[PDB]
Amino acid sequence: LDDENTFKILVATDIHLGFMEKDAVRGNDTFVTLDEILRLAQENEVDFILLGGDLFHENKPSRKTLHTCLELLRKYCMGDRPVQFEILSDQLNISIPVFSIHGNHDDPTGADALCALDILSCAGFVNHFGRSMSVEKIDISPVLLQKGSTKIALYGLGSIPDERLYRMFVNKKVTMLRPKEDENSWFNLFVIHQNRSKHGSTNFIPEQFLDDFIDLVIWGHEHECKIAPTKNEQQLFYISQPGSSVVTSLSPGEAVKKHVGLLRIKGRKMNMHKIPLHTVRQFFMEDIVLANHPDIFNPDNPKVTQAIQSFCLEKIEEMLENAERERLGNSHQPEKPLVRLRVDYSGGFEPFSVLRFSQKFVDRVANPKDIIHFFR
Template identity: 45%
Template structure:
């Protein structure tokens, strides 16, 4: 197995377009940026058509939220119908048990073998942490696209006590590939499952060494303060190439992993969803060519992406006089003009590339006399920059955390937010209370509970999540305290502190308790009414989900059933329903 640039052109080679983190619908209510994600998604699909790929492989977060707006869904569906349906022959075979690989789907059949559809470019996708299942039926927008036959949704796990990953097996001439998909799972849980040896990647029983094995995942790749991550050492040695989603920085060129797990490719997102340095680089998708055990990953630069520039300026290192607010603004104004000039030379010329760039200039000052109103300053550039309101970020140059604050420890929070890699809201909340002083610690509410509530508010748009959790925890605290013997005005504080400390020691139970509250029928019914949605939130992946399948069973060697009689006009080279000799898997 090798990563080669000399893979010979061959009609039997697999050609795959690889992408991840498209975040459709991001900033759709922003008049300037509303079309960004869809323009780039269309470019991705156009590249698939141009390069005549066999299929598209997505590593999660097709949508920015798991309950996208009707407008976002309609635009996605329209683009998939335009570019992925048609009469182009499918020259590959699906040779594993579809009922097993797609058992979580209402229609467990690969779409190009569905006699009711005319698919020209199949799309295979796992879900990420943004478009993950929710509601009591554990559904998401990915299930909707799957039921429509527009994508082949794989990698969804319904038993989170033990993971059995069955690969998609595809053949094209003499070439064989096995694609193992693992949709997003909380990193803490996944770490425990790997540690307890509860993750199984089932391999084909027949010609086990003839398959090119690909692993598609959507997890944290690197260690960050307060976060867990999937270690590269967890990837089994038979995996030859890992397509890593979730990380937005584009590291498209495959590199050797830390262990014997083969190569790792991190395509990165197709759109910037946060104003940080890792998002400011060039965006790519990959054209993956596979021949036997050799492969080539060709980076394809995206031309429709809005230009972005991130830079930090420390006034203490400035050679100019920036002692006053006015002089500081003059200096910053020149910096912005220089940035705009540099960006003007980077436009691709694509007709759908936005003209207004994104700029984040972080200005660190040492004296309050240097401070100015960043929002008001940005109005000077509102016709030249897409994010003029938050173009300038002013903050005191990082010093040691202040010892005393009245309410919010601004410096502690600022130091945490300085870390652009701290992109998980739960971990931001957790780190704040780990680093702030004792005066700012919670005395009634739990850190884990509030972190979970903030996560539901930010990532799942549950507007009353914090109010629900505060009410619930205060009620529990009250019910506990009033039951204590000998309760009086002198010892009530001691009982409260004792109860709070006991809950703090049970962080997992506390987080699960909050998720149950936010997933309750009463909560979801009210939330659905507020949001005019019939989809409710589900139990988290830390709660048990029953699984009727027993361990150590094997997929039956059943001939794939044909659908309705094929239409006479269809090309005879299609592999519809011809799953002759399906390959058994070794559980």
């Protein structure tokens, strides 16, 4: 009734299909989480799915990856209900289209310089948009969607090496074409796959660089979940940074609970509900600074390397237990948690072998080898 003027969109990024495909424990992770994401898409009778990059972990997906994926899309993206919106732009029923950009992982490759998405696109399940051609200047054109009276101008930028893109912005070469008919009638949506934090001098892209006419920015390269839209104080658009749906690196950010988004756009206004992903392997992480507690740990003490070591076993022992606790209400979560302990030995301390650790936890952790880390 009123919903016929509202876009319902499932928003996800960095699904990383096929990540650690061959590993015995973790190898089915991404395929299950993808099942959840598509299932959510279907339950919420979403208008279309919108992905921010890195759908595939490898730019040349294994037959297995690519087939599992197609099977899943076949399962959840087809159905009785007709697509309820239309593309005003150029170029067995499909009921849930998928719009995606390419990341740095699923980037273009091969003799034809295609992308995994392009295979998907070929099968009929995906609309690859956002891929830039030009060398000298980047002109971004919008896919124009329209549902009832409300109109989305969907802008994309498939992953580009940050150094280049920074340079391009600085030299005023990145320009965003606004629609011909009635610039102001459109909700301006922008999906990008780039570095948001600081890495080098130019190894990121400052939020300020993006045209202020943009309404919502889906920022997709960063794996840490920040899916709840937050306003940028200089430009005033919202930035949503959905997580990834797998942990591909044991970092503070990646420990934040993974979510997908349910995004509604009516007229030129939007709202973002977050949905938690239940099938994601848990990842608990804690820091331990030794220099912070002289009472418990003594710098010069030949039995201190043994006293520390004994506390780590306790910290890890409790993390593992808190895990078994949460998994109580969650039957969907895989059984063996990822666990990491970061140890800052600043002062007068020294490392120790992870072997004894690796062994004692072998069957209660999914990363027996990488369970601990040291630094100055």
